[PDB]
Structure formats: C-alpha cells, structure tokens
Amino acid sequence: GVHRVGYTHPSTLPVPCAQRWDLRLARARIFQEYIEEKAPGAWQLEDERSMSPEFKTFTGYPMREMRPGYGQNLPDFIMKKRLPNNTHYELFARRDIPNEDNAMYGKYLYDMTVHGTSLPSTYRMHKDINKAQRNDRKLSGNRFRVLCSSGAKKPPSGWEPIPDA
Amino acid sequence: SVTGVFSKGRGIGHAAVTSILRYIPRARVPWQPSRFGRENLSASDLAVLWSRGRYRDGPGNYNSGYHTEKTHVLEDNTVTMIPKHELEKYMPDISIGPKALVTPVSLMSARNGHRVTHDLLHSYDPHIGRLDKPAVVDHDNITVEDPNRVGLNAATLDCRGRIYRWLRRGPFFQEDHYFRRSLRLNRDGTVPTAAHEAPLMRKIVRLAQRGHLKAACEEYRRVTTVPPVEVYRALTACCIPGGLIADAVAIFEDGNSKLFYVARDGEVLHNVMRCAIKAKNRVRVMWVYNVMRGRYYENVIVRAEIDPIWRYRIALLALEYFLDHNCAEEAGTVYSYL
Amino acid sequence: LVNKYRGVWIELDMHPAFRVALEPQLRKLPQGRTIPKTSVDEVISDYINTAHLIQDE
Amino acid sequence: MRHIGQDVPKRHTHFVLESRLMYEKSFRDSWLHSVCRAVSQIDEPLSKTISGTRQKMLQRKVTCFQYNQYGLFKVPYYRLANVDRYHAVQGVPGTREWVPYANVSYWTMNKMVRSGNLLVHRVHYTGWGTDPHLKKGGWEHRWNKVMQRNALQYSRI
Amino acid sequence: QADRRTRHHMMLDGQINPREWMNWHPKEYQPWYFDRHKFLYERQQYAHFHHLLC
Amino acid sequence: QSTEFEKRMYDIRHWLHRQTTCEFHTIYRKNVIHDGSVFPTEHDPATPTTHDHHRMFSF
Amino acid sequence: VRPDVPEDQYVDSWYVCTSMTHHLGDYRPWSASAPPNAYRFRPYNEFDAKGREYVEYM
Amino acid sequence: LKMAKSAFGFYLARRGQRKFPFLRRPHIKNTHAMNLSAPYFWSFMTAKSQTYFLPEENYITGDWTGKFFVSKLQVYTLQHATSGSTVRVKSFPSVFELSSPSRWNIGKELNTLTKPRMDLIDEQMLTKKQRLDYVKAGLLPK
Amino acid sequence: MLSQNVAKTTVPSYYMIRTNLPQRKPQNQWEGVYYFGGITKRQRHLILL
Amino acid sequence: NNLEYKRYDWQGWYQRMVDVHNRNISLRCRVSDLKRLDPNGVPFVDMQT
RNA sequence: UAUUAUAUUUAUUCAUAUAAUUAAUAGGAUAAUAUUUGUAGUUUUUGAUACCAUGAUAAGGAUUAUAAAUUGAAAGUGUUAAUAUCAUAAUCAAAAUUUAUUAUUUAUAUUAAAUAUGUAUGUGUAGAUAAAAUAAGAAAUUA
C-alpha cells in the first residue's frame, strides 16, 4: 500500500534499539555505497531465471537488472562499470598486430643482432629477386618511382649513367 | 623519366660536420641503401605528411576543422569552408585553450600514463616521436596543428617502426620515462628542488609540524617534483606522538632510493627512530640504524651520507632505546659499531 | 645512472669538535649535496678573518 | 606509400595498427570520458558539499570540458572496426564470422584450423559442445557464467 | 638514372653480379671488423691459422 | 608458512612442462590489528549522517 | 573400433579424426581401473554412481 | 558489393539477406530518420532524457579554420533559424544546405529533416538494369 | 672475422614464400630471460682495491 | 607466465596485465575469532556486537 | 519374392557499406658512475595497387543397416605461395536499397536510455513454387 517510509528515533520507543535505516546509513558510509533515493518500493524484482532454481539457468546472483529503462547513458550505471583499462581490449591491442615478431622486438634490431644486416620482408625479397631475374633476361619494362627524385633528376657531380643495348 | 612524390629533402647533419664526415662511406641497407625517411622531408612537405595521416582529427581533412584548404570538390560539386566567424553564429565557440588538453600529473595513472589528450599519442620517451631532434613533450603549446612533429603519428612515413615501439612499450612507460626525461640531479651535485614546489612544500611542512598527518599526506599526494629534505623531516615528525611506525617507514622509503635519497638525512632517520621507540619495535630500531650505517651505493655513489655528529646522535638514540629496553644483544651490537 | 652525484666529492674530513665549532661558517659553505647561495666574498672573508686562530693545519 | 617497396602483401594491414592505437586512445580517454558523463548527467544532488547552483555551473563546466577534450574517444566499443590480423579480413562481432578468443574472422580462422595454425578440438557440428554450461543454457547462460566469475563472485569490499 | 650498377641483376657479364644485394651468401652480411692493423698472421686472410697462434 | 618451501614452489614456474603454466593461489593467515585513537568505537554523533551524505559522487 | 579399455586411456587427437592413447599404445585393461575383483568394476562394490553419492548424503 | 557506390563496395561482400543481431550493424544506414512520430516528436530519433546537454557538432571545441558542413547530429536551434547562416549536411550526393529555415525544426537533430532515401531517383546513376528493376518495384514508370 | 656468426637465414629464396618453414627460431620454453648480473674487470679491480 | 610472454617486449606489459587481473586480495575473518576479550577486560565482541 | 513403408504434414509479400600517404633499433631507482642528460651522413629505384598479377578448406540426400553406431561428401565456394608495369581509393562513429539464393511480431492493455523503420484491414484468397520420416507419436504399387 502507499505507505510513508517512517523511521522513529532510538529515543522515542520506551526501549532503545538500533534502527535498520541507520544501520543502512552506517553501511553506505563504511563501504562507499551510493543510496539511490528514487528507488521505488514497488520494484523489488528478482531475476527468477537467475535467482529461481526452477529454470535451467539458476545462477543465485541476479545476473542482471530487471529494469527496461537501462543503458550505459545513466550515471548509476557508469558508477558500477568496469573500465577498459587493463582488460582484454588492451591485451588484444598490445599483442594483435598483423606480424607477431613486431610485438616481441624491432625487426632491424633483431636482424643487426643475429645476422649483420637488416633484412627485407619475404615479400620484398620476392620483388627484388624477380627484379634480379626479369632484368636479367630482359629490360625496358620498368618505371622509376621514388620517394625522393632530387637525386635522380639531379645526380651527383659525376655519375653519368650507362646507356644500354 | 622519374615520377617521384617528394621533390627534395634536407640533410640531418650540417656541413660543418658532413664536409669532413663524407670521406668514409656509410654501410647502408642492402636491399634499399638510400633511405629517404621522415626526417629528411622539407618543413612544408612534412607539414603535409603531418596534417594528413589521421581520420577526422588530422587537419589534413577538408572538414576536420583545422584544415587549410578553402575549397573541396565533391564528385564535381564544390564546397567551400565556412569559417569560424560565420560558424559561431550557430556553433558557439567554447575554447578553453592549450591548458584544456593537458591533464594534471595526478591523473596520469587514471588516464593510463598520459597527460595530453591529443589525437596524436604523446610518448614521453625520446626515441618515438623523434623527427630530427628528439621529441620533447612540451605541455604548454600542444596545438592541433602540431608544429613540433613530436606526435606518434598514425599514417605517416616511417610510422610503422614507431607504432611497433609504442605497442611494445613497457608496463610503466609514460610515468617512468616522463619522470626521468625531467627531474635529474644537477652537476652542482644538488637535488632538484624547484620553484613551483616550494609553496606546496611549505604547506606540507607546516601541516605535518602541526601534527595533521593525513592532511600533510593528502598534500604530499600532490608532490610532483622532489621535495626538499625538511618536508620529509616534518612528514615523519608528525608521526612521533601517535607511534605511526608504518606510516613513518613508508614516508621514509618514498624519498629513500626513490627520490634521489632526499630522505636519507640524519634528522629524518632520527624522527623515524623515535617512531620505532614509541611503537616499541626492536626490529625497526635496527632497520633505522641499518639505513644509518648505509652501504657503499648510497654513501658514495649517490653521495647521500649523514654527518658524523648525526650518525652519533642516532647511535646514542639506538643505545638509549635498547639498553632501556633490555635488548642487550642488539644494544651491544650497535655499541660494537660505536 | 639516474642518481650519481655528477660532480667531484669534496670530502669534509673535519673532526667532531671543529665541525661543531665552525658551524655558522660551513653552514654557508658547500656541505653534502648542499650549496647555499652565499657569496664567495662572505665565505672567503670568513676564511681570512677566523682561520688564523685555528690551531690545526 | 604510392606502392613503392611494399613490405607487406596487404596494404590494408596498416589498419590493424590503426585499430590497436584506436584502442589505446580509448583506454587513455576512457576514465576521463566516463567520469565526465557521470558528472554531466547526475541529477539527484551529488553530495552535501556540492549542490544546486554550484551543481549547475559545475555540470556545465565539466560538459564544456568534455567537449574541449579534443582527441576524446567516445565511439562505442561495439562500433570500432574489428579486423583479422593475418589476412586483414574484417568480421562483424556477434555473428559466426568472428572468432572472439583469437580475434579472427570466419575466413582466416577457417584457414588456420584446416591448416595447423591454431590448436582447437573439433566437436560435433549440430550439438552444443563439451562445456556443461554451453550445453545447459545456450549462450546467454555462458555469458552469465563468465560474468559471474569475472565480477559477481567477489564479495566486493 | 638506372644502369647495370643500379638495376637488380642476378647475372652480369657471364658470371654473377656482385652489386645486387640478392646474389650473396648471408654469411657475408655478418658483422665483422677490420684486421689490417693487427699482426699480418692475425688477420682474416690467415683464418686457418687462428688455432695455431702463439 | 615456510618461505623456504615457498621459494622451492615458485621455481616450478620454470621447470614446468611444455605449453603448461601455473597460477599460485596462496591463502595465508595474517594479523591485522584493530586500534582506539585512529579507528574509534565512539557513540553516534549529534548530527546524523542522512542519505544525503552518501549520494552519487559523495563517495 | 578401439580396444575395450577405460576411456580415460584414450585422448582425442587434434586435427586427426581418430583417438590415440596418451601413453603411446601401452595399455592397462579395465581391471586396472578398479579394485580387485571389483563388481562391475565399481569403486566400492556397494552401489552405482548415484547410490554412492546418496548413501553419503544420508 | 555489386555496384560499388563507395570504395568500400570494392571491399565488402553482401552475404545475401543476412540476418543481423538486433542493433549491431557495421554500416549505420539510418533509413528511418524522417519519420513523423506525432506524440513522440521529442523522442523518436532524438536524445533520450529531455534535460540533456547538446551534442558536439554544436560547439567549436578548438581553434578551427572552419568546416565545410555540419552533421545531422547537431540539433536545430534558434541560431539555426534566426542567424540564417549556412548549415550543411553531407547527404547524397554531395551536401544539403538548410537554407529555408523554419521554427518547427527547433529542438531536434537534423536527421528528422535530411531525407535519407529519396523518392526522386536519378536514372543518371542507375544502370541499364537498375532502371528496369525500379520499374519492377514501382519506382520509375516505363 | 668471427666464426659463430654463421648464416641462420638461408640464401633469400622462394622456399620462404612456397614452404611453411619458420623464418624465425621457435621460442624456447625452458630458457630463462637474459639479465645482467656481472662485474667488469675495472669494477672488480675497484672492489679488490 | 612461462610459455611465451616470459621474455620479450611483451613480457613487461603482460606481467602488468596478469598481476592486475589478480590484484584482488580476499580477506576472510572468523567472527568466532572476533569473539575475544579486549585487553580492557571487556569481551571484544559479545553476542549483541 | 524375401533381409519390409513417402502421400502426409507443416510453408511462400524479404532490404541495407565509408571522407587517400603501410619503409628502422634505440634499455632510466633500491645495479660500484657513458649527459650515449637530448644515439642528426637526404635525395638510385618500380608488383598484391583504383590494374593483369597460377595454385590451396563450402552448398548440395536416393540403396554398405541394425547392433554395443551419427541423417552430411574433395573436386572447391571472394580474400592465401613465383605472369607485373594506368591512376593512393579501407571502418576512429551517425552513413545513398536492385541485391536471386529470404521463415514478420495477426485485434484486452502499443515509444524510458548510445536512436532504432508510417505502412500492405480485406473470402488464409493467381501461377509456380519451400521444408521435413532424427523426441516425438506418420504406414504399404523395389529398381
């Protein structure tokens, strides 16, 4: 029924006793519990599928809030929300790069340590071997695309390239 | 003959060096010896390579906001840039300024090590945003144009090696390298005591001297640079009456070996010894006499030794505690050093 | 090394009678990891005034 | 760039680093954004220390700050790209083409099981599986059991 | 512009082309240091005598 | 609790087998002191901490 | 299709639609997985899988 | 897909009439925006709690040189009618300027105002096949 | 110059693109991680002095 | 960890992720072992307490 | 011939992609000392691209069976390992239906959380079409 939440002091009764809302206040003080005051009394729903063992999925803990007006938009949600700092999103981030060796070290450093030189990719050395051979049997199909052209359009003081045949 | 994207570049070392350097060759990369990276770009071309290379928060994009071009052709339809002055009539400008991207140093751990909020991640180590000069993270002019090219760009030339370095970054990366890239002992042999920490250090020493321990500790929670030794003197001094051996030992250890051994001073050790007395701790008296004895590393390398008169005062306090506490064996040990 | 002194360590080898007797003097001179901003004249003037009465070479 | 000296076969495989640094910026702005949303939205008085007029001016200032937080990552985590590291295939999370635990798509992951690149155990195609949870209550049940252990079991202090 | 000393070449003039990176054993790519200042018998050309050195 | 045995236990973290790892759960008895000055068991105050002192961000 | 022998001796192979034994073909018969003369190779010849647990609950 | 409307049609398959999880879509094709929902006007395709702060195509967060067009995510307000300025939405094909301002627009986003799927279709983009197809479904006569 | 710096990579070939062989050594499991505990010649001379 | 995240660039931050995931510290106490006497001579916690 | 049954049931209104620069290593406290605090030689090449650029794993029932047994196959369906020589097209929110290869909620109560489909009342209603003998319950015309 529409009942006014009343709470009489431990002084009015002709026997004092610690009253339960004051105990609620002491507990929301000790463990920093937000007391949501718009909490209506008619909505003490429990998740039967999770709280009631007459379903295949009895969990015992209310695995969710039976509350349709829910979303991350709410501050009461944002309060009790685990943040993605140090979560699987980070682990995936810091180990899921297309090449895995580039997550254990730097490729040039590993190369200059175990070999001497810093080696290309398998794909690059494919391109370079094909260059080595398709410019062995034939020529005049290439192009000259560079990052910087100033040194090609402008060779050094010497370096007069050879005309082939 | 050649279709090339970059016309011209720039040398990293200058001719007061190169003209003597060139006479030995460089053992270059076998498969592509000439390496026209990002450092060699011009200023303007690299401003292009820095403007672009982000999704909507690199100004290279026509509708990114900090974009330079006024015209953009959308499939043979021209759109022109509505400037800020036309725009503010319906998008009222709120621009706090360059201080609104730099979080306080007390929110680094909450923001996962960072202080900036830029699109471009700001590593605090040198070797990551290093363009030609090592990238210094100046938190006072962090723009969206980003002139200093210190940002950990997303889609720039030579970005892959640095993105890999960023993902292989350490556990404590921003904090450790940000600490050490600043705040180092000056060749005068002195500890880095600064200007902006002096008033906060006054707050701490006054509160702790008054005995407001947790108040001084909440303020110490704001010690960004190093405190002078007296701040630890007071923050340990406050503990004496209540016998807070635990809080006191932790106040000692925070400068001891963590902050260039500021806390290794005879009077701070004396305060912490007093706390060991009032907490009745035979093992903490000996721990404090142990830090007093020191070892070679502190006593010589970091040169945080204690004046012999203070050594003696602390030793007499140890003996006065112990032979008053009947701890004959350990008192005899300290007198052995005497 | 992060914490090395980065400078020549002028060891103060005074006796525990004079390190107390000359205290206001050396309090304005460079002690361990401490260099007060005092003036070289002040320190040299004290050294010329006082040090004669000091009976220890 | 401009296809000169490409070291990888998939030019789109730069998007995986792009995404992982998207994730980094999300972790970096996450706490700030969540506290900003909380304080800007809070209607019932914050505390006995900040209330009312101060609440309105403070709320609006922190909203101004959440707006001035340039570089902020407020795109929801279900809305970021989700691509396979290996062959740059994208997979829509929530549907069969997304292996969750290996962060791969139906395609590359199918390749990696029909060749020996992952260690999985083939189980029957029509049934439910070996996990008694996944047999018991479908998929929301294993969701419940996972959250129950990662969060709900701690009697949080 | 481009020449038989720039273009990628497996074979150059009847024998192998040394200039192209891709015609070499990787053991030549290893890091090594100069010997010519050491004693003549301690150099890389007297490799088979390094075990006998006094 | 024998820290020496625990030392002998921790370095199974290395001689463990192939593709096999170890999480160590330790549940060890401790002593936490309750103490008078600092954590007082005093009476309730005069002014009562109502629900306002525990609202959102009041924590 | 594989020896009649306590199934915990087999392991389901990976990648191979077969089943191999963790000890490489070395076998121990059903009667090694039971007490001596165990009735139906029961753990204790008293009751079956649900008889044991419930005698125990009572 | 089949006819690459974008460069991502070059990159993404179709998967037939693939059934999707409720509200999980890699392409947010808000094909329902201009939906008059009479008693639900400040609710349908709008922000949820009436007392919300504005979205963020509504404040110049930094020192911009300017922009070419606003999003539909910036609400329509008094400054969008009275200031009579240029507010552009990237709609098909290039942009759509809200140059005939009115007051009923005030309060909502411009999504309820920028038509996503047009009733007029240009056969100038359709194929020799798509045109017969739109005749088939009843869009263009023939 | 040094002997043990022998080729651990092969002649850059097509057996990299055509075969499943591993272009990098498989990580060991019973190997520690390489740390530095060690005093130099000068450093030992210092302690002995 | 001792398989793969034992040793390289990722060893550090994986050790971080691990020990943070495990950072929980459960404290169990026996209320019967709160049923003791305060050295004041008062039982530390009685039935009402 | 025997070692053994389909003529029944439930079905059909079907749609979603976007705003160019992928070329490298660089260790920081409780460690007996590197400012290496802040490690500066530009510009000789070109394929996985908007473009030819080999390979390699699906969907599809019609006669190896009854007991301690499963009613899902190799013929390869977009992304993958050697052919080069037109052009940067790649998700960080808000998005443009022509795409055969799709099971929609049906008249007591109808918009509260990242926003979430305003159209098609009509005799269950042309033509041709879908599925299934498996915890449901089916029974008789072999090549």
- Method used experimentally: cryo-EM
Half-sphere exposure of A25 (CA within 13 A, CB side): 13
Query: Using CB atoms and an 8 Å cut-off, which of residues 1-49 of chain I contact chain F?
Result: 29-30, 32
- The DSSP element (H or E) to which A133 belongs, if any, is helix A122-134
| Type of residue found at I45 | H
Phi, psi of D90 (to 5 degrees): -95, 145
* Distances from the Cα of D4 to the Cα of A146, B35, D16, E2, E23, angstroms: 7, 13, 21, 16, 22
Which bases of chain K come closer than 7 Å to a protein CB?
Answer: 14-35, 37-51, 55, 57, 68, 70, 72, 78-85, 87-104, 111-118
E7 touches strand K (CB under 7 A): yes
Our measurement of CA G22 to C1' K105, in angstroms, reads 54
Please answer yes or no on whether D29 and B167 come within 8 Å at the CB atom.
Answer: no
Which residue gives the smallest C-alpha to C1' distance to K22? D14
- Residues of chain F in contact with residue A5, where contact means CB-CB under 8 angstroms, are none
The interaxial angle of helices B198-210 and B229-237, nearest 10 deg, is 20
Q: Is A75 on the interface with F (CB under 8 A)?
A: yes
Q: Is J3 on the interface with F (CB under 8 A)?
A: yes
d(CA C35, CA D113): 70
| Type of residue found at J14 | Y
- Residues of chain E in contact with residue B1, where contact means CB-CB under 8 angstroms, are 1
d(CA A107, CA A120): 9
Rg of chain H, C-alpha, whole Å:
18
| Type of residue found at J15 | Q
Contact status, residue B135 vs residue B123, Cβ threshold 8 Å: yes
- The DSSP element (H or E) to which D105 belongs, if any, is strand D104-105
The residues, ordered by sequence, that sit 6+ positions from B217 with a Cβ below 8 Å of its Cβ are B235, B247
Half-sphere exposure of B191 (CA within 13 A, CB side): 25
Tokens 């990662």: give the residue: D150
Give me the long-range contacts of D60-64 (CB less than 8 A, separation at least 24): D60/H53, D62/D36, D63/D36, D63/H53, D64/B94, D64/B96, D64/H59
Contact status, residue C6 vs residue B187, Cβ threshold 8 Å: yes
Min Cα–Cα distance to chain B from A71, Å: 24
- Chain H residues 27 to 86 whose Cβ lies within 7 Å of strand K are 27-33, 35-38, 40, 43-49, 55, 71-73
Name which of H102, H122, H108 is nearest H33 in CA terms: H108
| DSSP-based helix, strand, coil % in chain E, nearest 5 | 20, 5, 70
Query: DSSP state, B105?
Result: G
Q: Is F15 on the interface with D (CB under 8 A)?
A: no
Please answer yes or no on whether A86 and J16 come within 8 Å at the CB atom.
Answer: yes
Distance of alpha carbon G55 from its chain centroid, rounded? Answer: 22
Our measurement of CA I20 to C1' K75, in angstroms, reads 24
D141 touches strand K (CB under 7 A): no
Our measurement of CA B201 to C1' K92, in angstroms, reads 43
Min Cα–Cα distance to chain A from F54, Å: 5
Min Cα–Cα distance to chain B from D139, Å: 33
Burial label for B256, CB within 10 Å (0-12, 13-18, 19+), is: buried
Tokens 């990369």: give the residue: B29
Phi, psi of A19 (to 5 degrees): -90, 150
The interaxial angle of helices D14-41 and D53-68, nearest 10 deg, is 170
Tokens 């003549």: give the residue: E40
| Nucleotide nearest the Cα atom of B13 (by C1') | K40
Contact status, residue D118 vs residue D109, Cβ threshold 8 Å: yes
